Design a protein around this nucleic acid. Structure first.
Ligand SMILES: C[NH+](C)c1cc(NC(=O)CNC(C)(C)C)c(O)c2c1C[C@H]1C[C@H]3[C@H]([NH+](C)C)C(O)=C(C(N)=O)C(=O)[C@@]3(O)C(O)=C1C2=O
Ligand SMILES: C[NH+](C)c1cc(NC(=O)CNC(C)(C)C)c(O)c2c1C[C@H]1C[C@H]3[C@H]([NH+](C)C)C(O)=C(C(N)=O)C(=O)[C@@]3(O)C(O)=C1C2=O
Ligand SMILES: [Mg+2]
Ligand SMILES: [Mg+2]
Ligand SMILES: [Mg+2]
Ligand SMILES: [Mg+2]
Ligand SMILES: [Mg+2]
Ligand SMILES: [Mg+2]
Ligand SMILES: [Mg+2]
Ligand SMILES: [Mg+2]
Ligand SMILES: [Mg+2]
Ligand SMILES: [Mg+2]
Ligand SMILES: [Mg+2]
Ligand SMILES: [Mg+2]
Ligand SMILES: [Mg+2]
Ligand SMILES: [Mg+2]
Ligand SMILES: [Mg+2]
Ligand SMILES: [Mg+2]
Lengths: 209, 294, 112, 159, 169
RNA sequence: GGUUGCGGCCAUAUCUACCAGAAAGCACCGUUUCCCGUCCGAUCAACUGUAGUUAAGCUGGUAAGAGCCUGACCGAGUAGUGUAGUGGGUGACCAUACGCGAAACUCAGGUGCUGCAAUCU
RNA sequence: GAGAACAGAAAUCUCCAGUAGAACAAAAGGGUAAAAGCCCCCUUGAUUUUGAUUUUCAGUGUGAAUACAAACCAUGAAAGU
RNA sequence: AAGCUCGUAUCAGUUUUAUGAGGUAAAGCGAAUGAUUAGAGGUUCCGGGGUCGAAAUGACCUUGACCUAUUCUCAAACUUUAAAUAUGUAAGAAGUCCUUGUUACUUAAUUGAACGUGGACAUUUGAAUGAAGAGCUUUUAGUGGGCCAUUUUUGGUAAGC
RNA sequence: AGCGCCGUGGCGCAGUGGAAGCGCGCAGGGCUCAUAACCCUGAUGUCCUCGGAUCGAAACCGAGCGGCGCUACCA
């Protein structure tokens, strides 16, 4: 057993997901996808760090869980559990097949589950404070070893996971059109109703600081 | 009531046709009515459209065109009191007189008046307008009831019998005229004729005048105002029929306070729309009113 | 092969018919037991139980035949022998219940 | 195992358009087709009687026969090394006119007109269409428009 | 204001669900005949329930719809045997209400020894003048938001009228 | 220009919540002898236009409304793609040359138009 | 969703919302809302005479289907089907 | 191969203009179906626990579901949208306009339908380019094991499969 | 690996669309000095699990779990 990712590496087949035509597939081994202080705010975590791909390939659900475990262990041993929020941004939806006389009836049974990653696609995202840039970089360097192919750390200059580069987001915050939700934020748009906009963003519609 | 419908529902929602949505046409019935045999290429299928409001009977001859339906002739129960019927504008007698009026009006307009005189000896008997040999075939129209039920003894079938007795070749059967006893499976000429000259309204008048005075007065204050006795109803309906046979010409109203005055003075009461600057001004006024965390 | 299949058909056909004959003989001797011989009643019960169990095995074979085996001609005679076996089954069930029922059991005290 | 039915592989072909289900309208019931006309075949899935095959979907032909509720359309189809003429009997829901043909009629009416005044005053008929000819010499004004200079941008990653 | 938008009883429905067929259902149909003075209609089941002892397409219940002064006087007798107290449950959110009585000899006819005891459901729907706009055929519509009787409108109609009271909620 | 009858395109027309509607017209409305239909004159049928009411329907307007529609040099000449190379790269794939070219997003604007006939301060 | 004796999670009745999230004998995919669904009424056109056309295709056969013509009928007030 | 009828306005493995048709690539999921990550706010006359409890259409907290507004990622047998490339038709003389002849068809009707007579229309006879002749028939051979390359693509770990 | 069968009370087994039984065990009473045997009774089930068709099944149709049996040959 345990055929290599070198023979399940490239994207050769069409996406073959779990559906009503394909049942009795084994479960993925990755079950948790967000990690660290996942209830924190983008207020608390300004800097984003992205592990991105350079190859059009397939990532095993095993490679995802192993990279997540090693990265997690490194950041908790160094910087503690609450200093980061790590989210894996690929979900294994590909049922890989195994054949297991001759080539007659060669259509194979389900064997796995894979994340088809494109060039320039986020694999790992870590949001953290400005002082933990080093430790999140070396944790994602450990992640780059359990993951096949070539990957890059890009210092994402978006405030947290969201959008909206840091001066733009600072301007939005000091304008007051940003409301703190659970692990995310809500934005004021100039297209909704006046009454519900009033009752959901009082600070923009007041003379507050 | 927290039953507001979602954006996905409203996006996937297909609205019906306009007339279906306001519930005025059956497009199934209308398609089967107005679809023409394609080997005739130009012949419009003419519809004797009969409609009943609470105080009027509308009876038109309509042909179908790509730009919209066009009319050839119209007759109105509120134009019937010009002829002879000042009371009972939505009875079965006014329906028959309106069908007779629309038939005579459309044949007079078409120039088919010297032939196809109709009956002139109305007797409550079922017959079809036979084609005159060596001459034009009778004008063929089809009854458009619309949405009302096709029950036996209906005013729309009265307008049907009126157009048939006028001279329009409308195909019809006799199993929907009043007096068609299905046990005997024939027609009743006396009952049909009595109801032609309004025997039902008459016998209601004498039954009320015998039994209940206050009720009779309440339902027929107009009849007592005109001093029309209970047995001249056939007389006035007959005289209406030969007035229809005499002058089937559309006379418009006197049309006082003409069309430009109607457009100008009658309604400045429709409240006009605003523009972008006014809408923004109202928005800013509402921001100023709702300013603060109150 | 279809010839071998139809041969096994005809064999089980004949076995079912002779089983039906001897089951009917045991049934009529049961109804004419002279029921003072209760031991003879019980003995005839056990004998027709054995015969109806043999008919159970034959009927299950007929089930598999009519389900999957492509009988291809004789569904009529297979169904008729199935119906004969099942009416024998219900006769055995009625007889078997009749002597099962205890004279002062709650079912006989509720409804005669 | 393998199927070639009358409506095989016609799923999205005979689907209705989004928010265009229901009854088909009286414009396409009241349009008139006469013998020799040019029509486009696009099947309507709601009317199952008189449907074309999937091959004739989106196909232009000449109507040669008209009857009670359908028209007969002539279609040339390629089988083997030759075209074969096919006579389809199709309902007017599946039949639609040809805007290219109507534009040819407005063009021939315009051409007859143009030759009429060209003959009336006696010069410059010039009826036939010409393709897009090369552009001619022009003068552009720098007054109010000084050419602003452009440079390639550096490589900045946005993610 | 209140020009002619005054609540009136559209219809009153008398429903008896005996649960089986034959003698009891025939006698219940008879009860509805002498009570309403009007032919009842027998309602049929929709599917089988083992515990209920009912079968699909087997005649289970029987009901009458009455309207007008007869509906008003049957309603008055029902409130008289319910002693003019009804429940805030017993007053639905679309304004229509109803109750259930047992041993129907408390109102009207005597026992008629060949028929029996039949408890029964009163249900009453209230409408304001102008529900033809949603019940008629040509040019259908929906009533406006200053319409569609609410719980408040009906509870007040039953308190302004009849000198009746309600319970806790 | 309002309204009615018949319609064409079938949401710029729909949906939600309020407000207004002179006149006329629709509408709600009043009644059960007759034709007719229902468990029920509620629907339908018939009769009256009388006893009344714009409360609803309908029409129109409002809403930093939802939806829908139109446009943008907004995204984006991006994704994708036809053709070409003894181009690059171990490969996966990626640039370049001659061409075509989106969708979502964002922003701005709009919220039925119209035909035949009749009628209306 | 809100209600009504026994009656409850599910019996019957009533109202509101409900673009189809149901049903249309069966596989799946299309289609259908004053219907193609459900209920009721009447029927036998699931009839006769042969031709033409479409699919598979050799433009042969079989099967299935389409549009007519000449009759005779069914239904509906009728257009029609 | 034999040819035959004409060389007399015919046709293109082509483009343009105009008009259709398609549901792949892409995209989308705070759009339908199906899958799926994470919190937030709520609702229980109506899930399971505990606490204050005698219980209560009582109260507090815990955990599950249901709803609302969000979020992460997807679909050969999902889709609002939607290419590029390929694909159908038309670009006239067998055409257009005017007038009036036939009919047992059609129309209420000399109303239309189809085919016509007699006139009018040209400078280009109605886009480009090229035609090497165009069209038609008869008869008969061999063949009916294929293989490779670019690109698209299915099964397979892959294969000179 | 394929094919086929089986799965029901504590154990061995029947069971057809209106729907759960046989025998031995188990429980209570009796008989006997007592225990068996015998007599009179009573109770006993997630019908292997999950989903679907049906107005409804353990049965009909599908997915897996578990246990058996047959074939796996020519070199
Ligand atoms: C110019 N000439 C050489 C010509 C050429 C062609 N065809 C071509 O264009 C050539 N075809 C190619 C392009 C090569 C395939 C042509 O097709 C013709 C003609 C001539 C005409 C002459 C016609 C004429 N009238 C009636 C205008 C005439 O005098 C007679 C007559 N009354 O007998 C004709 O024969 C004429 O009608 C005719 O047949 C011609 C052509 O068809
Ligand atoms: C398009 N041109 C090339 C053309 C084509 C065809 N033929 C067709 O298209 C045939 N139609 C089919 C396709 C078969 C249905 C044509 O038939 C003709 C013509 C041209 C004209 C030229 C006429 C012209 N007259 C008006 C003065 C002319 O110069 C002469 C002449 N006096 O020599 C002609 O020959 C002319 O009168 C004529 O006959 C033409 C055609 O017939
Ligand atoms: Mg109808
Ligand atoms: Mg399509
Ligand atoms: Mg059919
Ligand atoms: Mg119908
Ligand atoms: Mg064939
Ligand atoms: Mg020539
Ligand atoms: Mg094209
Ligand atoms: Mg496809
Ligand atoms: Mg894709
Ligand atoms: Mg998209
Ligand atoms: Mg989705
Ligand atoms: Mg010539
Ligand atoms: Mg050969
Ligand atoms: Mg050969
Ligand atoms: Mg014992
Ligand atoms: Mg003992």
């Amino acid at each position: 057993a345990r055929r290599p990712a070198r023979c399940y590496r490239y994207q050769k087949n069409k996406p073959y997901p779990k559906s009503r035509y394909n049942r009795a597939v084994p479960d993925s081994k990755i079950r948790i996808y967000d990690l660290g202080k996942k209830k924190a705010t983008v207020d608390e975590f300004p800097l984003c760090v992205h592990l991105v791909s350079n190859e059009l390939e397939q990532l095993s659900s095993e490679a995802l869980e192993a990279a997540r475990i090693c990265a997690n262990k490194y950041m908790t041993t160094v910087s503690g559990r609450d200093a980061f929020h790590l989210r894996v941004r690929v979900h294994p939806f590909h049922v890989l097949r195994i054949n297991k006389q001759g080539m007659r009836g060669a259509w194979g049974k389900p064997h796995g589950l894979a994340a088809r990653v494109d060039i320039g696609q986020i694999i790992f995202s870590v949001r953290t404070k400005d002082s933990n840039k080093d430790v999140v970089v070396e944790g994602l360097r450990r992640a780059r070893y359990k993951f096949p192919g070539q990957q890059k750390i890009i210092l994402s200059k978006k405030w947290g996971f969201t959008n909206l580069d840091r001066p733009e987001y600072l301007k939005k915050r000091e304008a007051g059109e940003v409301k703190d939700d659970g692990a995310f934020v809500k934005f004021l748009s100039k297209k909704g109703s006046l009454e519900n906009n009033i009752r959901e963003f009082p600070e923009y519609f007041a003379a507050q600081a | 009531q927290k039953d507001a419908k979602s954006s996905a529902y409203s996006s996937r929602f297909q609205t019906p046709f306009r007339r279906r949505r306001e519930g005025k046409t059956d497009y199934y019935q209308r398609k089967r009515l107005v679809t023409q045999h394609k080997a005739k290429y130009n012949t419009p299928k003419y519809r004797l459209v009969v409609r009943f409001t609470n105080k009027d009977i509308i009876c038109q001859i309509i042909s179908s065109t790509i730009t919209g339906d066009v009319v050839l002739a119209a007759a109105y129960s509120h134009e019937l009191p010009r002829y002879g019927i000042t009371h009972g504008l939505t009875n079965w007698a006014a329906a028959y007189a309106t069908g007779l009026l629309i038939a005579r009006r459309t044949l007079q307009k078409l120039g088919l008046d010297e032939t196809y005189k109709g009956v002139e000896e109305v007797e409550g008997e079922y017959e079809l307008t036979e084609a005159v040999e060596d001459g034009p075939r009778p004008f063929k129209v089809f009854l458009d009831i619309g949405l009302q039920r096709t029950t036996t003894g209906a005013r729309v079938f009265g307008a049907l019998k009126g157009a048939s007795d006028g001279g329009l070749y409308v195909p019809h059967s006799e199993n929907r005229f009043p007096g068609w006893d299905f046990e005997t499976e024939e027609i009743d000429p006396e009952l049909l004729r009595s109801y032609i000259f309004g025997g039902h309204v008459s016998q209601y008048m004498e039954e009320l005048a015998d039994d209940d005075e206050e009720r009779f007065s309440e339902l027929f204050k107009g009849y007592l105002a005109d001093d029309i006795d209970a047995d001249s109803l056939e007389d006035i309906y007959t005289s209406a029929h030969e007035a229809i046979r005499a002058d089937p010409a559309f006379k418009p109203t006197e049309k006082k306070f003409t069309k430009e005055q109607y457009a100008a003075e009658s309604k400045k009461y429709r409240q006009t729309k605003l523009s972008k600057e006014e809408r923004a001004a109202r928005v800013a006024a509402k921001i100023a009113a709702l300013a603060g965390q109150q | 092969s279809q010839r071998k299949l139809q041969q096994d058909i005809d064999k089980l056909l004949k076995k079912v018919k002779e089983g039906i004959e001897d089951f009917d003989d045991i049934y009529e001797k049961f109804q004419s037991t002279d029921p003072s011989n209760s031991s003879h009643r019980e003995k005839l019960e056990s004998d027709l139980k054995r015969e109806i169990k043999k008919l159970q095995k034959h009927r299950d074979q007929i089930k598999t035949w009519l389900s999957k085996e492509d009988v291809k001609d004789k569904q009529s005679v297979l169904m008729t022998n199935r119906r004969l076996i099942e009416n024998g089954m219900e006769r055995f069930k009625s007889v078997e219940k009749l002597m099962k029922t205890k004279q002062f059991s709650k079912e006989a005290l509720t409804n005669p | 195992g393998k199927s070639h039915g009358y409506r095989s592989r016609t799923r999205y072909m005979f689907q209705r358009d989004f928010r265009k289900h229901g009854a088909v309208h009286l414009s396409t019931y009241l349009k008139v087709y006469k013998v020799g006309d040019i029509v486009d075949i696009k099947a309507n899935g709601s009317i199952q009687k008189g449907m074309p095959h999937k091959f004739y979907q989106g196909k232009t032909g000449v109507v040669y026969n008209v009857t009670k509720s359908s028209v007969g359309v002539i279609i040339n189809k390629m089988v083997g090394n030759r075209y074969l003429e096919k006579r389809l009997n199709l309902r007017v829901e599946h039949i639609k006119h040809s805007k290219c043909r109507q534009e040819f009629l407005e063009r021939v009416k315009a051409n007859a007109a143009k030759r009429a005044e060209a003959k009336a005053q006696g010069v410059a008929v010039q009826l036939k269409r010409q393709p897009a000819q090369p552009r001619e010499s022009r003068i552009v004004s720098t007054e109010g428009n000084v050419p602003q200079t452009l440079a390639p941008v550096p490589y900045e990653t946005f993610i | 204001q209140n020009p002619m938008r005054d609540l009136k009883i559209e219809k009153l429905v008398l429903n008896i669900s005996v649960g089986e067929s034959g003698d009891r259902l025939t006698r219940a149909s008879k009860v509805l005949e002498q009570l309403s003075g009007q032919t009842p209609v027998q309602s049929k089941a929709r599917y089988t329930v083992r515990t209920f002892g009912i079968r699909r397409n087997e005649k289970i219940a029987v009901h009458v719809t009455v309207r007008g002064p007869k509906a008003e006087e049957i309603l008055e007798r029902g409130l008289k045997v319910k002693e003019y107290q009804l429940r805030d449950r017993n007053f639905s959110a679309t304004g229509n209400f109803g109750f259930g009585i047992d041993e129907h000899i408390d109102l009207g006819i005597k026992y008629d020894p060949s028929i029996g005891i039949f408890g029964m459901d009163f249900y009453v729907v209230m409408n304001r003048p102008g529900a033809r706009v949603t019940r008629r055929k040509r040019c259908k519509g929906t009533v406006g938001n200053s319409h569609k009787t609410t719980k408040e409108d009906t509870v007040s109609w039953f308190k302004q009228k009849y000198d009746a009271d309600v319970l806790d909620k």
